[PDB]
């Protein structure tokens, strides 16, 4: 039921090195009602391959986007970390490129519309595009105009006709979720004026490799992207990569700016620097990806044995957060409700549900606080700093966290960290 990849999404070649294969795995954002059995739970092959031409890393299969996104789960309350990062995105886009007030900003994958709201607060006109009908209706209700559609060449034309030429087109994380990136590039080209920019924020393949972030591999994430593969793609569609900012968010990301090849925006030197860096760090060599694969095997084994060793000693263990990536981690490690008695999560609709595959219960933070947990496995480790900042009481009582990457570790460490 999920379609197999043939040619490379970015460059069009067909020379794939196998990197890792996790077998059939259930969908990471498909949380389940508790039940006696889960025999009909859908599973899809989860494996990654590396294109030797441009070094896009890609999943072997594309799960149907209508199935994934047409009813996507959301939250109505964004954390201060998320709000701060959304404010920073605005600041970078507007200040780095001198976007005047009253300019038009189009966002692909605009979701609840919070990122657009931040652009409006900075004095911009906005429009969103997001296929999740449930989420789009919420955004529209709040006053953030949103087209309940997938981005395409045809939607691009409808936008230009009714809303004009955007000074900025933004895609936050969504770009790695789209199979037909060639169509996106074409719709963008049509939309862009001479000094318009297309900006995309995606997890950075360099960081993913170096920090062993294999839990970010899940079916929604079709692509795992470095600057090289984006240049290869945009070359073929009259677009030029003009600038890149590296960011610590989501385990290391890149915010990439793209313009018309013959437009006003000059290419900054950082672009070539990052491509040279990617070469230098071995992204074009088979050994690198074989090295990634064994790190994964090593971390997976070590993590499982740590949890089970602590359990055998009579320590109680739970998951902190129930993010999509947590479900890759737990499934790949083969952990069950005997290993983690629950996963706490602040997202209301998740509370009372059960995790895909492992079927571990999801409970509220307020339930979590009634329980004498000794260790929390930090599944939402990309928010480690914000989480640790508010878990003083737990830490003071001798509670500990297990961090899965770069290697498995225990917080707090045995000595003060100052080196
Ligand atoms: N081809 C496509 N065009 C536009 N939006 C898409 C899309 N595929 C998925 N999406 C939307 O993008 C989001 C998935 S990505 C989630 C990241 C989101 N931008 C955020 O930071 O909050 C969902 O809201 C989904 O409905
Ligand atoms: Cl994502
Ligand atoms: Zn390629």
């Amino acid at each position: 039921t999920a379609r197999a990849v043939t040619t490379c999404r970015m460059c069009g070649a067909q020379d794939w090195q196998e990197v890792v294969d996790f077998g059939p795995v259930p969908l990471a954002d498909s949380f389940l009602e508790p039940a006696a059995s889960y025999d009909d739970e859908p599973r899809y092959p989860l494996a990654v391959v590396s294109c030797r031409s441009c070094r896009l890393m890609s999943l072997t299969h594309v799960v149907d986007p209508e199935v994934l996104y047409r009813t996507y789960p959301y939250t109505t309350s964004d954390s201060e970390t998320i709000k701060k990062h959304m404010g920073h995105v605005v600041a970078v886009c507007v200040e780095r490129f001198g976007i005047p007030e009253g300019s038009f900003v189009l966002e692909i994958g605009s979701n609840t519309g919070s990122q657009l709201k931040a652009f409006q607060n900075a004095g911009m006109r906005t429009l969103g595009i997001d296929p999740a009908r449930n989420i789009a209706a919420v955004a529209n209700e709040r006053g953030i105009e949103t087209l309940p559609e997938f981005f395409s060449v045809d939607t691009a034309a409808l936008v230009k006709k009714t809303h004009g030429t955007p000074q900025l087109v933004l895609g936050r994380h969504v770009f790695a979720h789209i199979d037909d990136v060639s169509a996106v590039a074409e719709g963008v080209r049509d939309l862009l004026g001479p000094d318009s920019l297309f900006a995309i924020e995606v997890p950075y393949l360099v960081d993913m490799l170096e920090r062993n972030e294999f839990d970010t591999i899940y079916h929604e994430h079709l692509s795992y992207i470095g600057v090289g593969s984006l240049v290869a793609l945009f070359r073929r569609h009259g677009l030029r990569v003009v600038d890149v900012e590296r960011l610590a968010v989501h385990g290391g990301s890149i915010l990439v700016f793209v313009g018309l090849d013959e437009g006003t925006r000059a290419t900054a030197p950082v672009v070539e620097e990052l491509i040279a860096l990617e070469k230098e760090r071995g992204l074009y060599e088979d050994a690198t990806y074989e090295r990634f694969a064994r790190h994964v095997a090593e971390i997976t084994a070590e993590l499982t044995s740590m949890v089970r060793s602590l359990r055998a000693e009579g320590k109680r263990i739970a998951g902190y957060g129930a993010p999509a990536k947590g479900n890759t981690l737990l499934n790949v490690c083969g952990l069950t409700a005997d290993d983690l008695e629950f996963c706490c999560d602040t997202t209301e609709f998740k509370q009372g549900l059960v995790l895909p595959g492992t079927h571990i219960p999801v409970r509220s933070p307020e339930y979590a606080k009634t329980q004498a947990i000794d260790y929390y496995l930090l599944l939402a480790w990309n928010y480690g700093e914000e989480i640790l900042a508010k878990e003083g009481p737990f830490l003071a009582d001798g509670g500990r966290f297990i961090l899965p990457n770069p290697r498995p570790s225990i917080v707090p460490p045995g000595e003060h960290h100052h080196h």
Side-chain angles (χ1 to χ4, degrees), residues 8-14 16 51-56 229 232:
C8 170
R9 183 171 294 114
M10 304 279 166
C11 76
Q14 185 153 21
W16 301 106
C51 164
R52 295 204 177 80
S53 170
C54 77
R55 291 295 185 177
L56 166 69
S229 60

Side-chain angles (χ1 to χ4, degrees), residues 208-322:
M208 185 191 177
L209 292 178
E210 298 210 71
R211 301 196 218 171
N212 308 312
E213 304 175 352
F214 68 87
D215 55 342
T216 61
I217 301 166
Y218 52 93
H219 290 102
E220 290 176 41
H221 288 163
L222 307 176
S223 303
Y224 307 84
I225 295 167
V227 183
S229 60
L230 293 177
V231 170
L233 166 79
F234 291 125
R235 262 204 201 96
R236 307 191 309 158
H237 293 276
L239 298 170
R240 207 183 356 104
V241 179
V242 299
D243 208 353
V244 190
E245 192 196 26
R246 291 189 72 171
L247 296 150
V249 297
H250 305 279
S253 297
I254 41 168
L255 180 56
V256 186
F257 297 87
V258 186
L260 298 169
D261 197 4
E262 28 55 55
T264 1
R265 303 288 179 184
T267 301
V270 68
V271 177
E272 260 302 332
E273 291 167 22
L274 266 34
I275 294 165
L277 184 147
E278 288 163 14
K279 288 183 160 64
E280 195 221 303
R281 300 227 142 276
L283 270 67
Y284 293 91
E285 316 215 68
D286 288 34
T288 303
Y289 300 94
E290 294 176 62
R291 190 195 315 142
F292 179 72
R294 70 172 186 79
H295 285 347
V296 171
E298 287 174 4
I299 292 159
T300 285
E302 183 184 349
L303 196 48
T304 300
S305 84
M306 184 182 319
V307 168
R308 267 152 200 177
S309 165
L310 293 165
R311 296 265 40 242
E313 291 166 14
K315 295 294 191 298
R316 296 176 62 189
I317 307 184
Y320 198 113

Side-chain angles (χ1 to χ4, degrees), residues 20 22 54 65 76 88 90 95 132 143 187 191 253 265 284 355-356 410:
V20 72
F22 297 131
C54 77
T76 71
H88 185 251
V90 169
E95 301 302 338
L191 232 23
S253 297
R265 303 288 179 184
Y284 293 91
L355 300 182
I410 307 300

